[PDB]
Amino acid sequence: GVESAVLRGFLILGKEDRRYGPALSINELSNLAKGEKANVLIGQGDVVLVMKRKRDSSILTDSQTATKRIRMAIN
Prior knowledge:
75 residues; alpha+beta; Defensin A-like; 19% strand; Polymerase basic protein 2; viral protein
């Protein structure tokens, strides 16, 4: 997960769920709420939302193998 890599605390969601309509910056991503997502650019060209920690993690284990969404279910 190159997206979450830089962040060092998010998960790899994807370019969907535009229902959020955030499009904010990373500096604000930290103010987000756990279990929630937020669309942030990772190259000024790809708009994808991230997924906060499911509880607690230093860098939040992730993987770029799942771009559609994350490999975890939050309820």
